[PDB]
Amino acid sequence: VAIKMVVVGNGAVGKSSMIQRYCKGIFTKDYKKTIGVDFLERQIQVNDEDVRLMLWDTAGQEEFDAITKAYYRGAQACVLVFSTTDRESFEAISSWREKVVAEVGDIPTALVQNKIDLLDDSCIKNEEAEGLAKRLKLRFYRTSVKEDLNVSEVFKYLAEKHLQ
């Protein structure tokens, strides 16, 4: 029993970091990276079952080539990510949603405001974020990959939603 999920959003919102935190338990400050993967994975327990979650980073690519389309193909859940400190990343969300729906249909999706550890100097107000989440009909999480807040919860919610 495997579940494929795509992580979707503008550059530098924390997508690859989110995947690395969830699958490996690590957060790297320096970002000095070397090797390419198409997905990471990890086992999760849901409704007394051993689910294999495979997380693909769609890397902010707006026009989908054959590789990008393969990233989206067979996606069973979607994480839409914006950054606390990047207003354009928040504004791009409704467009990203349309691209995801056009590509794969109406799969379980969550909206994530990442970098919430930096909330004291946020580019976006909670009321705006909740307002967008309501408009798009999406459960909203405020997340810190850096501090491991509301990362596991997002993927668990989506996995449960798919297996309901």
Ligand X SMILES: Nc1nc2c(ncn2[C@@H]2O[C@H](COP(=O)(O)OP(=O)(O)O)[C@@H](O)[C@H]2O)c(=O)[nH]1
Among 8, 17, 79, 124, binds ligand X (CB under 6 A): 17
- Please answer whether residues 23 and 151 qualify as being in contact, where contact means their C-beta atoms are separated by less than 8 angstroms: no
Q: Among residues 51 and 151, whose Cβ is nearest to ligand X?
A: 151
**Residue 148: which of 119, 124, 114 has the closest Cα?**
114
Q: Which stretch binds ligand X (CB under 6 A): 13-21, 67-75, 95-103, 128-136?
A: 13-21
Binding flag, residue 11, ligand X (CB under 6 A): yes
With binding defined as CB under 6 A, does residue 118 bind ligand X? yes
Please report whether residue 144 would count as binding ligand X according to CB under 6 A.
Answer: yes
| Contact of residue 80 among ligand X, Mg ion, none (CB under 5-8 Å per partner type) | none
Buried residues in 97-118 as b, exposed as e (16+ CB within 10 A): bebbeebbeebbbbbbbbbbee
Q: Which helix (H) or strand (E) holds 158?
A: helix 152-163
Tokens 């957060």 locate to 27
Count of residues touching ligand X (by CB under 6 A)? 15
Residue 60 assigned as binding residue: yes
Residues making up the annotated binding site are: 12-17, 30-31, 33-34, 57, 60, 114-115, 117, 144-146
